[PDB]
């Protein structure tokens, strides 16, 4: 209960329809969570120097769900207020925040809606429990909506996970920015205007300015009150054991999610009773989520199977049946080459150049400046390259071309595909003309 907020993020059928696959939806959702975590962690909210996020259930609604009569999110046309209300109509006591990700256009082109937090009174925001409220229905107001399209055009992911930050900030008790100090976009000072407005702006920022990813001083101070009055209510410790998020960790053997999340037949889901949940089923001795060399029928693979493919320092790696995890790779012998013949492997990774494989140290080092340079270890007595006749027993006569891009002449060049290297600074025709004219050409030409 220190610094982490558990999110219940749901995606409607249009989100899946645009992204097509569950993998794409989960990748976008993890990207949004990571972006919002990066935004919030850096922003020192006065009281706390780190406020992370950790999604607990990634619940994704498939296009086939659209035919479900009891699902109210299938309606193609629906107001933003009504959308947020139906998000709040569900029970969300076990979550710091609960969000619905949609791909539907909203009236006036709004990019979503959340519930404004408050330090004291005005129920609604983070760490909010279900209560009767008015209208006769118990609404969990730890809820917010977000759409990835406005005016019929899909919102890019920078703007999408900026408006996600906007909605969570409203859930965090930060109102829309006001004043010249906290809204620099409208400021007539050019230096501040180029920085751009902050996240907590009534109008969606383009996401291409400096302050578009950062919380303002106004918003940070507002969030400070909420995070000093309600943080130790629903937050959790960093890295706390909370299974069902699809992330295997300590205190568990495997993870599946919830009942309608995974098709794994050898791991208990979250709806299973305490103690059994997120654990291997009795009899199924391993899980594919645990290790990459487990059978689809959830049993330890034999010794024939090899987890990994060919590597720069190992052949394949063999796990056999004793653990789900594939063990450390069996390294190739010392001085074993890697990509092209520029370096050799020592301790499972290749570094330290090539020339010490047969034994000599790399030279620092007109086309002879680009392949590889190494002398006899006793000082640059003969700094000749690999293909030189001075090395007639180690490299024979084979020349090793550097990678296309690796610099020559310290770091004022770059090797091309033609064993040559041009200056990275470069001159350019027009700039050469400018330097030939801006110089005192009266005596430079004659």
């Amino acid at each position, epitope marked *: 209960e220190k610094n982490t907020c558990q999110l219940y993020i749901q995606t409607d059928h249009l989100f899946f329809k645009y992204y097509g696959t569950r993998e794409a939806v989960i990748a976008q959702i993890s990207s949004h969570v990571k972006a919002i975590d990066t935004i919030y962690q850096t922003t020192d909210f006065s009281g706390i120097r780190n406020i992370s996020f950790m999604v607990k259930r990634i619940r994704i609604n498939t296009t086939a769900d659209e035919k479900d009569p009891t699902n109210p999110f299938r309606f193609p046309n629906i107001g933003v207020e009504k959308f947020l209300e139906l998000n709040s109509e569900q029970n969300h006591d076990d979550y710091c925040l609960a969000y619905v990700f949609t791909d539907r256009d909203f009236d006036d082109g709004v990019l979503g809606l959340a519930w404004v937090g408050a330090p004291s009174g005005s129920s609604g925001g983070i760490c909010e429990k279900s209560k009767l409220y008015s209208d006769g229905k118990k609404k969990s107001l730890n809820t917010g909506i977000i759409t990835v399209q406005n005016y019929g055009s899909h919102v890019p992911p920078k703007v999408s996970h900026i408006t996600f930050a906007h909605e969570v900030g409203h859930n965090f008790g930060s109102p829309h920015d006001s004043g010249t100090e906290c809204t620099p976009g409208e400021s007539k000072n050019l230096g501040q205007k180029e920085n751009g407005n902050y996240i907590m702006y009534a109008r969606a920022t383009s996401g291409d300015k400096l302050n578009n990813n950062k919380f303002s001083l106004c918003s940070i101070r507002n969030i400070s009150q909420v995070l000093e009055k309600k943080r130790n209510n629903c937050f959790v410790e960093s890295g706390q054991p909370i299974c069902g998020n699809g992330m295997v960790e300590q205190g568990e053997e495997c993870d599946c999610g919830y*009942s309608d999340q995974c098709k794994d*037949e*050898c791991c*208990f*889901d979250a*709806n*299973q*009773p*305490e*103690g*059994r949940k997120c654990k291997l*089923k*009795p*009899g199924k001795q391993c899980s594919p989520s645990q290790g990459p060399c487990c059978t689809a029928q959830c049993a330890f693979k034999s010794k024939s199977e090899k987890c990994r493919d060919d590597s720069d320092c190992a052949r394949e790696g063999i796990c056999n049946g004793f653990t789900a995890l594939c063990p450390a790779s069996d390294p190739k012998p010392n001085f074993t080459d890697c990509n092209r013949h520029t370096q050799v492997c020592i301790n499972g990774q290749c570094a330290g150049s090539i020339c010490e494989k047969y034994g000599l140290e790399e030279c620092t080092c007109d086309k002879e400046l680009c392949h590889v340079c190494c002398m006899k270890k006793m000082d640059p007595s003969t700094c000749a390259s690999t293909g030189s006749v001075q090395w007639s027993r180690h490299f024979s006569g084979r020349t090793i071309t550097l990678q296309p891009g690796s610099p020559c002449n310290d770091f004022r060049g770059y090797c091309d595909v033609f064993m040559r290297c041009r200056l990275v600074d470069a001159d350019g025709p027009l700039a050469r003309l400018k330097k030939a004219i801006f110089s005192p050409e009266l005596y430079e030409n004659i």
Partner: antibody, heavy 117, light 109 residues
């Protein structure tokens, strides 16, 4: 409260199939597993097999061939089917729920099973 | 494969005494995964102790089990006159679900 009840044929002809139904109530079968433990007359408990919340089954190794357990989550009924029961198969067939940490907290009354030509 | 050895098989304790019940597993299993059920010779085995330290609902407090690892136990502070039942030690952390042989109990009169 939460109760489990088993309906059994009682009399089973030798080498003829058996069907017992444990119509559970009070819990969602999707999140709880219902076991099947039989008991010979005045003997120790014997485990047949279980059906989990996701429909997965794990039977006893010595009764794998004959055992058959299925369920309908919406209908809230657990079904146990046995085939070719010899004279030793007579027992009392209890259905139990796999609670927290594998505990068999709630049990049914059970059905006496008599096998005799 | 696990076998839950329960000793002693037959308990004969006079009224009001302290009778202990021992369940020994073949391989060490988690403390919370072992349980206890009594069966009063014609009734469904009701859960008595779960996690080997927490009592069930509607049970006397004289039952105080304990154990961790390879050997487990169940202790009775005062032998109640209605305790005539077979107490079963059980585990389902690993397949198969193995019930104990059943430590029968009788009132030594």
């Amino acid at each position: 409260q939460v109760q489990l009840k088993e309906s059994g044929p009682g009399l089973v002809a030798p080498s003829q199939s058996l069907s017992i139904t444990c119509t559970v109530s009070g819990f969602s079968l999707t999140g709880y597993g219902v076991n099947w433990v039989r008991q010979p007359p005045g003997k120790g408990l014997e485990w047949l097999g279980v059906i989990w919340g996701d429909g997965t089954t794990d039977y006893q190794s010595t009764l794998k061939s004959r055992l058959s357990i299925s369920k309908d989550n919406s209908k809230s009924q657990v079904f146990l089917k046995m085939n070719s029961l010899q004279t030793v198969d007579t027992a009392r067939y209890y259905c139990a729920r796999d609670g927290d940490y594998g505990r068999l907290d709630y049990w049914g009354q059970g059905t006496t099973l008599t096998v005799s030509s | 494969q696990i076998v839950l050895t329960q000793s002693p098989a037959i308990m004969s304790a006079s009224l009001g005494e302290r009778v202990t019940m021992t369940c020994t597993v073949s391989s060490s299993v988690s403390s919370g995964y072992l349980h206890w059920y009594q069966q009063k010779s014609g009734s469904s085995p009701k859960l008595w102790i779960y996690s080997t330290s927490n009592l069930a609902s509607g049970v006397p407090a004289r039952f105080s089990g304990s154990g961790s690892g390879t050997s487990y136990s169940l202790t009775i502070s005062s032998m109640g006159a209605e305790d005539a039942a077979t107490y079963y030690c059980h585990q389902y952390r690993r397949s198969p679900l193995t019930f104990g042989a059943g430590t029968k109990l009788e009132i030594k009169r």
